Structure formats: C-alpha cells, structure tokens
Design an enzyme around this catalytic site. Sequence first.
Site, mmCIF file in Angstrom:
data_model
loop_
_atom_site.group_PDB
_atom_site.id
_atom_site.type_symbol
_atom_site.label_atom_id
_atom_site.label_comp_id
_atom_site.label_asym_id
_atom_site.label_seq_id
_atom_site.Cartn_x
_atom_site.Cartn_y
_atom_site.Cartn_z
ATOM 1 N N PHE A 164 -19.917 34.041 36.273
ATOM 2 C CA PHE A 164 -19.251 33.930 37.787
ATOM 3 C C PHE A 164 -17.891 33.514 37.473
ATOM 4 O O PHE A 164 -17.615 32.786 36.591
ATOM 5 C CB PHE A 164 -19.881 33.028 38.830
ATOM 6 C CG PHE A 164 -20.542 31.562 38.296
ATOM 7 C CD1 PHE A 164 -19.549 30.718 38.769
ATOM 8 C CD2 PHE A 164 -21.327 31.475 37.412
ATOM 9 C CE1 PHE A 164 -19.922 29.511 38.274
ATOM 10 C CE2 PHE A 164 -21.858 30.116 37.123
ATOM 11 C CZ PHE A 164 -21.082 28.896 37.390
ATOM 12 N N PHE A 201 -16.742 29.775 47.125
ATOM 13 C CA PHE A 201 -17.653 29.323 45.943
ATOM 14 C C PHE A 201 -17.654 30.158 44.637
ATOM 15 O O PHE A 201 -16.786 29.585 43.801
ATOM 16 C CB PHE A 201 -19.090 29.316 46.500
ATOM 17 C CG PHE A 201 -20.226 29.063 45.530
ATOM 18 C CD1 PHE A 201 -19.904 28.236 44.335
ATOM 19 C CD2 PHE A 201 -21.368 29.359 45.655
ATOM 20 C CE1 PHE A 201 -20.803 27.893 43.529
ATOM 21 C CE2 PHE A 201 -22.453 28.856 45.039
ATOM 22 C CZ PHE A 201 -22.164 28.334 43.805
ATOM 23 N N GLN A 217 -20.071 36.598 41.371
ATOM 24 C CA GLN A 217 -20.904 36.610 40.187
ATOM 25 C C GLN A 217 -20.944 38.248 39.740
ATOM 26 O O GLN A 217 -21.344 38.893 40.887
ATOM 27 C CB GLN A 217 -22.058 36.166 40.519
ATOM 28 C CG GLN A 217 -23.245 36.222 39.436
ATOM 29 C CD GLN A 217 -24.514 35.091 39.689
ATOM 30 O OE1 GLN A 217 -24.510 34.509 40.463
ATOM 31 N NE2 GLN A 217 -25.541 35.614 38.876
ATOM 32 N N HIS A 235 -24.001 24.942 33.771
ATOM 33 C CA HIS A 235 -23.570 26.361 33.436
ATOM 34 C C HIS A 235 -22.441 26.123 32.515
ATOM 35 O O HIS A 235 -21.663 25.092 32.409
ATOM 36 C CB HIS A 235 -23.171 26.901 34.761
ATOM 37 C CG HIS A 235 -24.213 27.161 35.681
ATOM 38 N ND1 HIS A 235 -24.770 26.401 36.365
ATOM 39 C CD2 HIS A 235 -24.903 28.375 35.798
ATOM 40 C CE1 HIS A 235 -25.809 26.972 37.002
ATOM 41 N NE2 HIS A 235 -25.928 28.333 36.578
ATOM 42 N N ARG A 286 -22.766 39.360 43.715
ATOM 43 C CA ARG A 286 -23.146 38.269 44.746
ATOM 44 C C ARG A 286 -21.475 37.735 44.714
ATOM 45 O O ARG A 286 -21.032 37.139 43.793
ATOM 46 C CB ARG A 286 -24.095 37.226 44.078
ATOM 47 C CG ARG A 286 -24.241 36.018 45.064
ATOM 48 C CD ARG A 286 -25.458 34.986 44.443
ATOM 49 N NE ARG A 286 -26.488 36.076 44.423
ATOM 50 C CZ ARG A 286 -27.251 36.164 43.437
ATOM 51 N NH1 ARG A 286 -27.199 35.877 42.114
ATOM 52 N NH2 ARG A 286 -28.302 37.149 43.526
ATOM 53 N N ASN A 324 -27.026 31.524 34.721
ATOM 54 C CA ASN A 324 -28.309 31.342 33.982
ATOM 55 C C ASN A 324 -29.643 31.066 35.008
ATOM 56 O O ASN A 324 -29.373 31.078 35.977
ATOM 57 C CB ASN A 324 -28.303 30.174 32.905
ATOM 58 C CG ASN A 324 -28.120 28.873 33.652
ATOM 59 O OD1 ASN A 324 -28.798 28.495 34.429
ATOM 60 N ND2 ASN A 324 -27.039 28.065 33.056
ATOM 61 N N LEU A 332 -22.191 22.223 39.340
ATOM 62 C CA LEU A 332 -22.637 22.819 38.136
ATOM 63 C C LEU A 332 -22.248 22.269 36.607
ATOM 64 O O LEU A 332 -22.874 22.928 35.759
ATOM 65 C CB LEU A 332 -22.112 24.172 38.430
ATOM 66 C CG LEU A 332 -22.441 25.210 39.804
ATOM 67 C CD1 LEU A 332 -21.656 26.499 39.651
ATOM 68 C CD2 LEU A 332 -24.076 25.010 39.840
#
EC number: 5.2.1.8
Length: 164
Positions: free
Chosen positions: A112, A59, A62, A125, A54, A101, A121
């Site tokens: 990521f 951004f 991942q 995270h 991903r 997660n 986040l």
Amino acid sequence: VNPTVFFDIAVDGEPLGRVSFELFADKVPKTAENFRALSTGEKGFGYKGSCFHRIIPGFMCQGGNFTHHNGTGGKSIYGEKFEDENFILKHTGPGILSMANAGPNTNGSQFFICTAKTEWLDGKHVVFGKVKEGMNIVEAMERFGSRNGKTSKKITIADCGQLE
C-alpha cells in the site's frame, strides 16, 4: 544504490500518469528487492496488469494481487510468503510505501501507498520505500476510492519497471 521503480497507472484504460518510488534497499534490502523484481516482472510474475483493489481516501491505496500456482492474492519472489525484515522505518506521512500482510511474517506481493501518517501501522507493517514523483497521481487515484475501499473505476498498473 537504492533502486527506483515506476508504475504507469490507468483508470478503465485511460492513462493517468506515472508514479515512481525510491526503494530503501539500504535499510530493508530483502523487502526492497521483492518489490523491485515484482515491478520488473523478472521472475515471471509481478505487478504489470495488477490493480489497486482497495483505495481508502485519506488513508491508503492498496494493490498487488495476481494469479499464481496456489492463489490469487499475489506472492513474493521468495515463495508464497516471507518474514518481516525489520520495522526501522515508520509510516510518517503521505507517499510511504509499505507491505500489506495477514499477520506477523506473512508478506507476499501486496503493498500500500499511504496518503497520510498512519502510525497505528508502525511495527506491524514493513515500510520499505516512498513515492519519489507522482504524488499528484496518487491523489487522483484517491478520487476513485471509497470509505468501503471498493473502487468506482478500475485502477490498473498498465506498465511497470525499474528506472535506476
């Protein structure tokens, strides 16, 4: 000593380059150690041959899935999942390394690399490292991402290990 790890990244097998990371063992030792051991492969599983499944330009990138006894999303060195160690460190900008997660206290192997500040986040995270060298490689990986996150070519961790 904060450990240093590397990934050699490839695009449909074509070498792209190396990304190295500092792991903040001084602040997040159990989370740093998970990533370190999964990058060496020493537990008999880990990131070698995994991909970045991903990639959302602007951004994050991942990755970290692999096959294990119970599934296909990867796992930690402490069993299937482990606790959120702390949230001392924040998603301050490009190069931050942080745990994916599925809710509180569900860390496995997925992770990521941020390509921007992602403060929404913070506190959800666990940040545990940062890109040391190779941010230009991470920028190039982005070009194979999408708004969707699906990648247009396969972005693979061809090799990985510990440097220091």
